[PDB]
RNA sequence: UGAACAGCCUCUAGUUGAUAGAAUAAUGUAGAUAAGGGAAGUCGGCAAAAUAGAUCCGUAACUUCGGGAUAAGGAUUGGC
RNA sequence: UCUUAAGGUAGCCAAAUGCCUCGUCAUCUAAUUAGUGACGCGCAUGAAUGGAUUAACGAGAUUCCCACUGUCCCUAUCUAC
RNA sequence: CAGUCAAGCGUUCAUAGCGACAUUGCUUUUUGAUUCUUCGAUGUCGGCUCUUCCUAUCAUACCGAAGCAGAAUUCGGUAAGCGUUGGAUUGUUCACCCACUAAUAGGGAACGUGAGCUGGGUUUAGACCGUCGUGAGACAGGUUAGUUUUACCCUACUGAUGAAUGUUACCGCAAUAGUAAUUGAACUUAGUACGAGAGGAACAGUUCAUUCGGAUAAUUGGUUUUUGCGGCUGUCUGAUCA
RNA sequence: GGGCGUGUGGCGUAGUCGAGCGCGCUCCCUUGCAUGGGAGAGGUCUCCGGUUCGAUUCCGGACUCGUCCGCCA
């Protein structure tokens, strides 16, 4: 399944949500509807956290989320980290991250193998990232989008790009990740896929105006069969 | 604000009447915008509607490229410049007015903002969070 | 709470205390004043303004 | 013709007129409505303003998007000593309203509060309430007689308290006596209260108690003459105007052929006494403790006193009402305490507030520090410190 | 001091005359400063602000070839 | 071809000269009874009643731009008298 | 501006909404008509500022009707409590566009308001052009430049004292007068009711905001004769210190 | 704002209730200082309703264009 739902009228959940496979992540000021597609689709198998970063509901494009690590801003309080360390389980790490660019969604596209990171991140952040995350790096922009974690979806199986990317950045960044990767659009045709939607190994969640193609596309490329 | 308010927004000290001119954050060639209204202000005698910080208001392209100039659209305020209050207390401000152009559902013409954008802005609209780069 | 430091001199910095300052690379300065805002302002060296925490570490004051 | 543009009044009509007040004690015009069921309890309070300061608290209002999060906020501080029950007087009511019939007193009368029965204290007799007491230190029979008189009679039974100025760092010695209505039992278990409490003190805590929201009553500061544009806040006139500026241009038609009295003019600002309400109470310190600064998470034994003392004021040595916001009046000035006259849901009445930390630096600058300790800790020694 | 019988301070000389005392309300007259915005004010940038000396670099259209021109636009300046 | 002494030539223009008129087209602006460039059956332009052009100059009249600012949003404060 | 009658329009159907041919009125925010008052002078444009009043109600409250399924809209009632904006052009009233908004309703008060301002226009004397005139000169034709005086009196209004009620002091009562709050968005209800679909509500609840008002100065900002501290120029006190 | 009149082929223009000519150019014929001739195409008669049997034609409404008259000191 691509779930349809929505943030009390917002069609973009990667924005108000972090789904990884041990765990998710969804904004205090949600909707009925909105919690209760995660707690049917995830089940009691997968905690969901409700949570604040740094003061915002947005917490999605603030963070970047690992099975085995979660990365946060310097400007989360020690109240959310603790709530996030007592919610979350013993395996996955919360590391704070003091870095200048400071939205670890937006800056980070990344897996439980292998990530893509903004060119002109710090070279201690990208240490952080490959010790907590376990996950090595590649500094690279999808044809000339500087943030990929807004303009990749991405996953084990599969991976979902920009529908305006040069085919030659398509064959290089799926030889650099290991997946397949297909450009194409989510959302009735908003550009921002990463921020679009969320997916795991078995769970895709996007808003209700994706049509039946380009959800067709996610199936396809996620493996979600 | 007005229609594409995601949620409702705290006051913030008023910093950019009619007639700003600030600069454009976004990549889609522009260089200035210029307001000419503000969404959703009241109606005083003699009172310039003026904007803060996650604002929607209506501005002109002065500077840029000629198929963005000589038209209206509508724009969104990211950086303020004049301090302001939150309720945890800090006073807090950038050292330029920025804003992007959006439709009046709010999601960018352009595609990547540069620079910082304000929490208040990114909080109540998506598409800004989505293509900001730093959050504060 | 939290208690924060003066990017300038060093002070701390209770709750609604000063200003706070985002510069344009994105860098975040907290003034626990007028004063070090000013002087930050006018580009002044916290190095060689005598009475800051930079300025006294520098020139092993009290020690 | 008509007015071109439409714009609101300048102004409220309601609080006309802009005179100085009768007194520097605001009246107390309503107390809260009786109701014969609960224990005998006062309306009100006195205190003096001695000056604001900041605090921060966990926010809990389930939908805010500042829910379960920090917030600073402004309190001011109202320095309260226990109040001492001199006197009590009852009310018959009557067509043309509520009148008093007798009033019942206390032996032993302080200086402080027999000072108010002078002008020249010093160049005294001190004769004031000795053959009062005379008419006392017999069985009982010029007393009781009044007072089953006001069980008899007298619908309402007010108190007679005054303050104690001498505890406050005011220089003043003559204390503020006023009349605070009891709301509870028969009008014989109200003059029983009274007689029981004659001669003795009340604290602050017995009448209020934490998130509670109550009126403050005071005379406002008072700032003399004053012209139209800030005693009203109308337009300033353009640059170019003979004959000066801060003033407003037409004062009225030329039929009726009078100024009105909704025209804006020039004249007193301030002084004027003002009841101001819904303010939630924060803290309800005690003066016999340290530590009153200090919270359950701040944990450093400091007292509600800034560093320096408070400006212009002085110690809080005594009891005190932490209080949410701005009151009237400035400090050193006496106001009233009053209870709510209606019960407010509101979801913000009814919240429950437990205080982080409360600031004590320096309000004579830009205070650095809390407490002494912090600032000989950060600064290290001194030249005159040996 | 400075280009200078400019402005500012001083020497010789000459005055110390102009009803005074006490307070510091409004509105004035004269002098000033203002966060953010920058003419949205107004008939109209009225009024105010900004620029300013000197040295070096650089200087357009047009022209009656004489000019425009300090065009515009940049950099520097103390003490030892 | 008539009428008359002869019939407005070269130029110029909604010009300080155009009633209609806020003329029509373009440009300038988000929006212009303003400005500029064109057009000309021009109420009622026009050749020492001087026509057209014109560098430099102007305490002349008008429009736009940059800088600048309490002119203004929206007022506040200080000094002397 | 409002009625009465109703041939017709409205698929059908006079009157949901309109309504010809006729006819009865109201108003004095149009312009006329008249010449009563003022020529030993009542300051004639417009704007700015400010108060109050009217209702023939643009919005907000509660309702009735529909050619009212919902959404949007139209007609009407009680209603003047409360609001009715920012700009480009023009001296304008008016107009016309841009834009926000719940809405950008109409008017009066000596065509409110010049010892309140301004002086762009009109409306002196200078000057230019066109037309007219032999000419001096004329032109609600165009253009440019053109002194805006006085309140200290009475009343009114805003504030401030105060004799006399045996004296003085404290605590009070309340006749009368005034009065104040206003409007919107988002989430949810709910993609629900309704509908064939396209579309698409409302009540209760929650969080904010606009306009207004009354205070206040903990914080932030402004202000500086704290001439408080430091720095700097020129000159003077022989230098130094000051 | 109001009044009065106007609207035909690509262009100009004739119309009494029963759409023609000229100009542009389609073709053919015809020939210096480039003509002429013959067959062509071309309209929702500004639009919408009613009358008639049928309206360019009669009527009503709307649009459009062109004239005339209109604020103040
Ligand atoms: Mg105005
Ligand atoms: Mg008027
Ligand atoms: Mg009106
Ligand atoms: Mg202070």
């Known amino acids: 399944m691509a779930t349809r739902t929505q943030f009390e009228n917002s069609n973009e959940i990667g924005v108000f949500s972090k789904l990884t496979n041990t765990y998710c992540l969804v904004a205090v000021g949600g909707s009925e509807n909105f919690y209760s597609a995660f707690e049917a689709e995830l089940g009691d198998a997968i905690p969901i956290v409700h949570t604040t970063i740094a003061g915002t509901r947005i917490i999605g494009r603030m963070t970047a989320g690992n099975r085995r690590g979660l990365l946060v801003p310097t400007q989360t309080t020690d109240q959310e980290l603790q709530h996030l360390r007592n919610s979350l389980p013993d395996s996955v790490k919360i590391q704070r991250v003091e ?40 500094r690279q922009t999808i044809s000339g989008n500087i943030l990929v974690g807004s303009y990749c979806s991405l996953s084990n199986q599969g991976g979902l790009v920009h529908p305006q990317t040069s085919v030659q950045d398509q064959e290089e960044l799926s030889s650099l990740l290991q997946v397949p990767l297909v450009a194409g659009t989510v959302n009735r045709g908003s550009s921002v896929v990463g921020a679009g939607m969320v997916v795991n190994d078995y769970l895709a969640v996007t808003g209700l105006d994706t049509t039946a193609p380009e959800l067709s596309v996610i199936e396809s490329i996620f493996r979600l069969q | 604000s007005g229609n594409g308010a995601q949620g409702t927004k705290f006051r913030i000290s008023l910093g950019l009447p009619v007639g700003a001119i600030m600069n454009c954050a976004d990549n889609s060639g522009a260089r200035n915008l210029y307001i000419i209204a503000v969404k959703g202000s009241g109606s005083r005698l003699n009172r310039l509607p003026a904007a803060s910080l996650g604002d929607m208001v209506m501005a002109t392209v002065k500077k840029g490229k000629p198929e963005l100039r000589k038209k209206v659209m509508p724009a969104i305020v990211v950086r303020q410049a004049k301090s302001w209050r939150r309720r945890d207390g800090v006073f807090l401000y950038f050292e330029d007015n920025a804003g992007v152009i959006a439709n009046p559902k709010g999601e960018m013409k352009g595609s990547a903002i540069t620079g910082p954008v304000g929490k208040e802005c990114a909080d109540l609209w998506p598409r800004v969070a989505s293509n900001s780069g730093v959050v504060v | 709470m939290k208690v924060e430091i003066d990017s300038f001199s060093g002070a701390k910095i209770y709750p609604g205390r000063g200003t706070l300052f985002v510069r344009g690379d994105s860098k975040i300065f907290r003034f626990q004043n007028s004063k070090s805002a000013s002087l930050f302002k006018q580009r002044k060296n916290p190095r060689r303004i005598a009475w800051t925490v930079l300025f006294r570490k520098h020139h092993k004051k009290g020690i | 013709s008509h007015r071109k543009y439409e714009a609101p009044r300048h102004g409220h009509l309601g609080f006309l007129p802009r005179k100085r007040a009768a007194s520097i004690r605001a009246r107390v015009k309503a107390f809260p409505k009786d109701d014969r069921s609960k224990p005998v309890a006062l309306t009100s309070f ?66 402080e509060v027999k000072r108010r029965f002078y002008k020249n204290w010093y160049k005294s007799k001190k004769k004031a309430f000795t053959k009062y007491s005379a008419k006392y230190a017999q069985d009982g029979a010029g007393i009781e007689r009044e007072l089953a008189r006001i069980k008899k009679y007298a619908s309402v039974v007010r108190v007679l308290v ?145 560093m320096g003392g408070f400006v212009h004021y002085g110690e809080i040595k005594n009891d005190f009402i932490m209080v949410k916001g701005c009151i009237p009046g400035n400090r050193k ?28 630096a320096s309000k004579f600058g830009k205070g650095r520090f809390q407490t002494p300790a912090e600032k000989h800790a950060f600064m290290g020694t001194l030249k005159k410190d040996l």
């Open chain 1, 99 to 138: 870095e200048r660019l400071s939205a670890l969604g937006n800056v980070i596209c990344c897996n439980d193998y292998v990530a893509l990171v903004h060119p002109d991140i710090d070279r201690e952040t990208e240490e952080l990232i490959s010790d907590v995350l376990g996950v090595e790096v590649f």
């Open chain 4, 46 to 111: 006195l205190g003096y303003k001695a000056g604001m300061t900041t605090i921060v608290r966990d926010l809990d209002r389930p939908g805010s998007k500042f829910h379960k999060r920090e917030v600073v906020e402004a309190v001011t501080v109202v320095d309260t000593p226990p109040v001492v029950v001199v006197g009590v007087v009852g009310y018959v009511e009557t067509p043309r309203g509520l009148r008093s019939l007798t009033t019942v007193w206390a032996e032993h009368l302080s200086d």
């Open chain 4, 162 to 306: 005054h303050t104690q100025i001498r505890k406050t760092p005011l220089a003043q010695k003559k204390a503020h006596l006023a009349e605070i209505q009891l709301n509870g039992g028969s009008i014989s278990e109200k003059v029983d209260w009274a007689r029981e409490h004659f001669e003795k003190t009340v604290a602050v805590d017995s009448v209020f108690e934490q998130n509670e929201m109550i009126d403050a009553i005071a005379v406002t500061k008072g700032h003399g003459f004053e012209g139209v544009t800030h005693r009203w806040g109308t337009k300033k006139l353009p640059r170019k105007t003979h004959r000066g500026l801060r003033k407003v241009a037409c004062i009225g038609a030329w039929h009726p052929a009078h100024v009105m009295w909704s025209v804006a003019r020039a004249g007193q600002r301030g002084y004027h006494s003002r009841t101001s309400i819904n303010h939630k109470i924060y803290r309800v310190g005690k003066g016999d403790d340290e530590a009153n600064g200090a919270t359950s998470f701040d944990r450093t034994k400091k007292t509600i006193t800034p």
């Open chain 4, 333 to 360: 000035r006496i106001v009233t305490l009053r209870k709510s006259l209606y019960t407010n849901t509101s979801r913000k009445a009814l919240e429950e507030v437990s205080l982080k930390w409360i600031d004590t």
